[PDB]
Design a protein around this ligand. Structure first.
Ligand SMILES: Cc1cc2nc3c(=O)[nH]c(=O)nc-3n(C[C@H](O)[C@H](O)[C@H](O)COP(=O)(O)OP(=O)(O)OC[C@H]3O[C@@H](n4cnc5c(N)ncnc54)[C@H](O)[C@@H]3O)c2cc1C
Ligand SMILES: Cc1cc2nc3c(=O)[nH]c(=O)nc-3n(C[C@H](O)[C@H](O)[C@H](O)COP(=O)(O)OP(=O)(O)OC[C@H]3O[C@@H](n4cnc5c(N)ncnc54)[C@H](O)[C@@H]3O)c2cc1C
Ligand SMILES: [Mg+2]
Lengths: 391, 391
């Protein structure tokens, strides 16, 4: 049939756009998705042996301080009262985390009060002067001191960035706070929780409107010419890779990827907490997720659990792209593609959005906020009142 | 104590050198090995749950037509009568392999005699003229025809090389024979078998002589200065990476790596043969190894088996290097390092050998042949009669 709007990609950005067009302007929307499932990287699914919901592209924790977004998402799902907390494994011991009075007292072997901890860190971090810092390693030492740096930062950084911290620029550290309280709540956003029926149901609700069609297993580039010949005045919101859209004509944007190993174990509980960071070099993974703990309210089985080991890697051409590397070279490459994108927008009615469309890491709430904004300020005016898509 | 000779690396090249020096010249040899085990990539070990011997760095099949090598290795191990055969999985069917009368009859649906098969291939391969071939894909079609190419070569090549076959040079295909008989013995060497007590015992026997010390978990670069200060007239045979030896001063040599996934299944037999190639794009691995079938003479358990999925990847800086990529750029980089190596040989008594030391893929028998030759023609003359190490 006929379409008023094409959305490429069914992640949170894509589905926010598609939903808002359908329900707020009455528009016919086609969502083209190349994967065999919707939801982009927020997709979740039960592990078969155990029934436990697993986040297939990495652990997804929802948090936001944006009231508008919080009100928007709650139309599609309820949230549990989950609060994220993380522990760290170093030299055979499990530490409270992030760095705070708990970790400090554990690591140094006795209670440090807020004033005493402040004094300790100050003294140890004085080894290097921050403005003299030549690189990441030195800057981190100049902020938290060498003992804490070498125990909980050095090797974890090396694993996560796949680069020796001495070869990372000092530039990539703004602050490196130690909490001078025992508060170990990981995020400090106003709103936080996990979707009660899980992420996939949430995303399916966003696509529920009759005026939205979702075509899975479909690559936009395989179908666009005849789809747009069908509906020439239909604008496009594209949330796939930016460099691919222009046939890599400016070069490939660099990304980091993640490898996961899912394992079902014959115990009811492997580590007693959702996420354990592994700070030492003697194991190759950065973190282990245990998914039963994301939803304690669920009646999961008692004799099995599923865990997931996470590993960091530079992305090869065909790896899933997760984090932009963002070298100067990358930023110059990006610069060229957004010029192309602005010209494609003006000439072909194609908007570029989302994590892949803009070469940006985006949290779920930031992707949603981004899409709501594109809708309100660029796309809806066009669809409703013929306004230009040129900014 | 004192040493007459340093060998860096305890793979087949290294241990051949160390053994020949110890037993044929009476020399004190120290082998420095950075891994926690000896044997280099030929190392094997029993999987714990099943007891089954697994080749930890890929399936290792011994074959040679070199009588000297065959006589040499049999001093350290007995061989079984194993003959390697490979099958290929395409579109839900298992095919005899390599391409021959069996595969051809299966694939085309009826018996083709030697003359008829010859005629078939000739006709189909005539689609493209070999000298007109613009790339790998076209050259392969010009040799075996499009139907066979698209079924058993196209996607397997894409997976193994991590490159679209249209973007590989025609240059990388010499011949692509179809066997016009039913003979499916994989290798055509005079001698073939598997070590009766397994690869690790074999390698341990090579290092058995009292005059050989093996230090595990030791990086040559961490220890060389004081080791050589200890024994200044001791020559060195280095079989680690060539580019690393000279601090990557000419750039990094490019390699391909392999990823493996070991799995123990609750069946006595998963695929009924040691190696199954997967020629289709719908699975990411290239091959599955089932190790019980490498040693049918062993009394392995009946209710479990261990398999290994193999995947191809370009090597990152810290991946295990398995196959040289060998671009023109790589060959120019290599060229510079062998000039450096020749100067290091003349000035510091350091020989460069083996797979890593020469940027070469070497089969086991070719590594051994190589080391025997370095011994006889370069190193033994030096150790015995003070001859120069300069060639
Ligand atoms: C490991 C990992 C962990 C994360 N953890 C969190 C977290 O804890 N909390 C949080 O708030 N956010 C988290 N995020 C970000 C989260 O996934 C966001 O929902 C995501 O960034 C949403 O942005 P997006 O919709 O633009 O991208 P995506 O979710 O990637 O959606 C893009 C969709 O576009 C499809 N597509 C791409 N190309 C084409 C094409 N040619 N044709 C058709 N379809 C195409 C893709 O298949 C994909 O489905 C995490 C991300 C990752 C990778
Ligand atoms: C998947 C794979 C499959 C293979 N299959 C076969 C087969 O089927 N049949 C066959 O004949 N051959 C096969 N081979 C080749 C086989 O492994 C050979 O025995 C190997 O090439 C022997 O050559 P080498 O001794 O020079 O290298 P290696 O076996 O790699 O030995 C090198 C040793 O040097 C050590 N080392 C490196 N750097 C240092 C350092 N700075 N300090 C101290 N020690 C160091 C390394 O840890 C390593 O142990 C295969 C190889 C691979 C990767
Ligand atoms: Mg890589």
């Amino acid at each position: 049939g006929n379409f008023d709007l094409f959305v490429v990609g069914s992640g949170f950005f894509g589905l926010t756009i598609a939903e808002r067009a359908a329900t707020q302007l009455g528009k016919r929307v086609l969502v083209i998705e190349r994967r065999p499932h919707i939801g982009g990287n927020a997709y979740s699914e039960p592990e078969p042996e155990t029934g436990i919901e697993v986040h297939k592209y990495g652990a997804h924790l929802f948090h936001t301080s944006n009231k508008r977004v919080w009100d928007y998402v709650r139309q599609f799902t309820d949230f549990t009262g989950y609060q994220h907390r993380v522990f760290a494994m170093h030299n055979g011991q499990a530490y409270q985390f992030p760095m705070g009075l708990g970790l400090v007292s554990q690591f140094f072997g006795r209670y440090f009060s807020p004033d005493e901890a402040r004094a300790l860190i100050a003294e140890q971090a004085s080894e290097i002067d921050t403005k003299d810092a030549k690189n990441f390693e030195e800057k981190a030492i100049s902020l938290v001191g060498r003992p804490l740096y070498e125990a909980f930062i050095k090797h974890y950084t090396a694993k996560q960035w796949q680069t020796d911290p001495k070869d990372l620029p000092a530039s990539n550290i703004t602050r490196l706070p130690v909490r001078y309280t025992f508060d170990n709540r990981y995020f400090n956003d106003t709103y936080e929780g996990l979707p009660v029926e899980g992420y996939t149901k949430w995303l399916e609700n966003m696509a529920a409107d009759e005026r939205i069609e979702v075509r899975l297993d479909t690559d936009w580039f395989d179908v666009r010419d005849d789809l747009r010949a069908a509906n020439p005045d239909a604008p496009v919101v594209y949330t796939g890779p930016l460099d691919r859209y222009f046939d890599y004509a400016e070069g490939r944007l660099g990304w980091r990827t993640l490898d996961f190993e899912l394992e079902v174990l014959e115990t009811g509980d492997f580590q007693g907490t959702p996420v354990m960071n592994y700070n030492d070099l003697d194991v190759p993974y950065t973190r282990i997720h245990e998914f039963r703990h994301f939803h304690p309210e669920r009646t999961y089985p008692t004799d099995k659990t599923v865990i997931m080991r996470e590993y960091s890697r530079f992305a090869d051409n065909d790896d899933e792209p997760y984090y932009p590397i963002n070298t100067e070279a990358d930023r110059a490459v990006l610069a060229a593609y957004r010029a192309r994108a602005k010209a494609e927008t003006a000439s072909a009615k194609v908007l570029f959005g989302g994590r892949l469309g803009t070469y940006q890491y985006l949290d779920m709430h930031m992707a949603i906020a981004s899409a709501l904004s594109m809708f309100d300020n660029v796309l809806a005016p066009h669809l409703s009142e013929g306004a230009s898509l040129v900014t």
